[PDB]
Amino acid sequence: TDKDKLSYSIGADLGKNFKNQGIDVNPEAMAKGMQDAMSGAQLALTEQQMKDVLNKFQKDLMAKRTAEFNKKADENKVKGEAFLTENKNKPGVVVLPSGLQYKVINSGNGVKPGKSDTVTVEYTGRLIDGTVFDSTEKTGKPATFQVSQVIPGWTEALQLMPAGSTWEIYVPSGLAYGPRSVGGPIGPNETLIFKIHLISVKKS
Amino acid sequence: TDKDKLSYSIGADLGKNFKNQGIDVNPEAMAKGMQDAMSGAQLALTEQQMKDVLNKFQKDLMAKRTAEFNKKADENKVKGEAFLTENKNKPGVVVLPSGLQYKVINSGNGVKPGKSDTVTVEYTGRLIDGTVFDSTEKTGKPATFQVSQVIPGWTEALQLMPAGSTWEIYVPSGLAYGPRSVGGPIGPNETLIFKIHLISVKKS
Numbered sequence A, B: 001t002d003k004d005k006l007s008y009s010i011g012a013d014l015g016k017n018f019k020n021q022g023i024d025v026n027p028e029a030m031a032k033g034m035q036d037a038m039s040g041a042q043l044a045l046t047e048q049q050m051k052d053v054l055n056k057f058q059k060d061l062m063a064k065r066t067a068e069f070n071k072k073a074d075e076n077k078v079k080g081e082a083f084l085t086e087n088k089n090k091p092g093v094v095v096l097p098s099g100l101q102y103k104v105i106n107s108g109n110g111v112k113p114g115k116s117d118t119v120t121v122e123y124t125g126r127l128i129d130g131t132v133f134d135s136t137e138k139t140g141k142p143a144t145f146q147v148s149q150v151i152p153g154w155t156e157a158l159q160l161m162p163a164g165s166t167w168e169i170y171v172p173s174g175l176a177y178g179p180r181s182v183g184g185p186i187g188p189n190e191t192l193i194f195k196i197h198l199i200s201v202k203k204s
């Protein structure tokens, strides 16, 4: 029946998650507790008891995540440097003192923005694996930022770009979000790629 | 074993939650999905399929919450008015045009704050059932607010209180948080009680 239908779905949903993480269990004793709970029956474990163990489960989960995080970080830095080394050679790529690299898609003729100016742009940011994490295409509307409020790579690139230009920049993690990053698709020590079209400079 | 131990705890934890809410299920088909998932076996339902039904489960959950919310709201207003009606009589209670009620614990002799002044106070806010939702006792440190940035009942009361006084105010929901309130311990149309000690007035 409709009941039977959903129940499976929820558990299928749940069960995957656990596994994918690190929750090594036995759905038999686990199915047991569920029935106790719903039947409002007396629980095989003291409120305290459970909490005591759950509290230890999370603490150990936290340890696990931190493990992955620090491992991902070391991994992405390694991948990040391989990408840039590989890219340094590619046709049209210029490498700057800061390690920031760019390739000119189309050169503009307007003024280059200063450190304090406001800029209007259109862009798409992607990870080395093509995954798009941000872009003005979705919103269909250009973005406006103050040159100094953006990530270092952008700050470094914009000061070199004539208004009207379209560059593709390749950003070392130290010039993007760095070792930290419990944010969106961007992880720790992730090197990023951006296609940036600088529309105009507001020397405000 | 240690495994068996935890598994139960998690499921006991989970199972309660569902029940307490409205998730009428059968932990048998639900235990089934969990095993499929972990064994990485082929799932009895198409990725789509499950989502299709889960998406419908939440939407129906949302309907359920909204149900409770609106019901709680009508309930708390009724309780709120019974409390104030009962309280209007009690020794020392003054009822104001706005329905706000207060009782003077101890009268100060300083100046009464104006609408724009900053005030320094110590206080404890509780629901009609004694549940404390806020207080400066916990932090051990007085709070400072601008008379107009606080809830109406407070704004109404403070303008009447001589600096140094300690009043207990009984606040109609329309002068506290009103019909809205997906916040802390405070729900919809909840009438509140406060013990407020006005320490000083900064006629800033």
Ligand SMILES: [Zn+2]
Binding pocket: A122
């Ligand atoms: Zn365009």
Ligand SMILES: [Zn+2]
Binding pocket: A197, A199
């Ligand atoms: Zn353009």
Ligand SMILES: [Zn+2]
Binding pocket: B122
């Ligand atoms: Zn005190």
Ligand SMILES: [Zn+2]
Binding pocket: B197, B199
């Ligand atoms: Zn005092």
